[PDB]
Amino acid sequence: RQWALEDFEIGRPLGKGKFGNVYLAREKQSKFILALKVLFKAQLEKAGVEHQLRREVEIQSHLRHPNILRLYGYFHDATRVYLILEYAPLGTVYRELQKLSKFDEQRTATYITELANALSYCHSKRVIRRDIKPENLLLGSAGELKIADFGWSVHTLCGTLDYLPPEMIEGRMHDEKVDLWSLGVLCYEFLVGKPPFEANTYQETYKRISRVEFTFPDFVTEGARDLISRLLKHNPSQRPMLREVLEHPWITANSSKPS
Numbered sequence: 001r002q003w004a005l006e007d008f009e010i011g012r013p014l015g016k017g018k019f020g021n022v023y024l025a026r027e028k029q030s031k032f033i034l035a036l037k038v039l040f041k042a043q044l045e046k047a048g049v050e051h052q053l054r055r056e057v058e059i060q061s062h063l064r065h066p067n068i069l070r071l072y073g074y075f076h077d078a079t080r081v082y083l084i085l086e087y088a089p090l091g092t093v094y095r096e097l098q099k100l101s102k103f104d105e106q107r108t109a110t111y112i113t114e115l116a117n118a119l120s121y122c123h124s125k126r127v128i129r130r131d132i133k134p135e136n137l138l139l140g141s142a143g144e145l146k147i148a149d150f151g152w153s154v155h156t157l158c159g160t161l162d163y164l165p166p167e168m169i170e171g172r173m174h175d176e177k178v179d180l181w182s183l184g185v186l187c188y189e190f191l192v193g194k195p196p197f198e199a200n201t202y203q204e205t206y207k208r209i210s211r212v213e214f215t216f217p218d219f220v221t222e223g224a225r226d227l228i229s230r231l232l233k234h235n236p237s238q239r240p241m242l243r244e245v246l247e248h249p250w251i252t253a254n255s256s257k258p259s
C-alpha cells in the first residue's frame with residue numbers, strides 16, 4: 001500500500017472534474033491499466049472537505065461488489081492527492097444518455113436491477129449515499145453499471161437540488177430511504193431524458209421537490225408510472241424496500257439480470 005508517482009505512466013485525460021482531472025494510467029511493473037484521479041490540496045483545504053475525502057476513501061476501500069467501482073489505493077506528494085481507481089472502458093451513463101437521448105424499457109430496467117443489488121449490499125454494511133447522478137455512474141467492458149461516487153456516504157450554495165430527497169433539503173433526519181428516492185429520480189431520467197424536477201432556478205427546483213410535482217409524457221407506460229410513483233413519495237415511510245423493487249412486475253418483465 002506504498003505508492004508514488006514514479007510507479008505509473010500517465011495517459012490521456014478521462015475527464016476534468018471540479019478539484020482535478022482523471023487520467024488513464026499504467027502501473028510500470030505489472031502493466032495493470034487503471035484510472036488515476038489527481039486532486040489539488042489548494043481547492044480542497046480552501047473548501048473544508050479535507051476531512052471528508054479522508055473518510056470517503058476509507059469507506060470505499062473496504063467495498064467489494066461488481067456494480068461498485070473499486071478503489072485500489074492512494075497517496076500524496078508536495079501539493080496534490082492521487083487516487084488509484086478501477087478504469088471503466090465504456091464511460092459515463094451521462095455521455096451515453098446525451099448520445100441516445102433516451103433509454104428503452106429493457107436497458108432502463110436492467111440498470112435499475114444492478115443499482116438495487118449494489119444498494120442492498122451497501123445497506124447491509126450500513127453505508128448510504130446523499131445523491132446518485134448519471135455523471136457518477138460508469139460502464140464496464142460488458143456494459144454493466146458501476147457506482148463511482150459516494151458523496152456523503154456513511155459507514156448560498158454549491159450543489160444542484162435535482163437528486164436530493166424532500167427530507168434532506170427541508171432539514172429533517174434521514175435514513176437509508178434516501179436511496180430509494182434516488183432510484184425513482186433515475187428511473188424517470190433514464191426513460192424521459194431529463195430528471196423529473198428540472199427547472200430554470202434553484203429556488204423553483206426547491207419548491208418542486210418539496211411539493212413532489214412531476215408529470216409524465218405520453219410515451220411512459222403504466223408499468224413504469226407505477227414503480228416511479230411508488231418511489232417518489234414525500235413520506236419516507238411509504239417508499240418500498242429494495243427486494244420489492246426487484247420483484248416489481250415491470251422490472252421482472254423487462255430486466256436482463258437476476259436479483
Ligand SMILES: Nc1ncnc2c1ncn2[C@@H]1O[C@H](CO)[C@@H](O)[C@H]1O
Pocket residue numbers: 014015016017022035085086087088089091092135136138148
Ligand atoms: N475510472 C474512471 N473511468 C472513466 N471515467 C472516469 C473514471 N473515474 C472518473 N471518471 C470521469 O471523471 C469524472 C470525475 O470524477 C467523472 O464524472 C467521470 O466522467
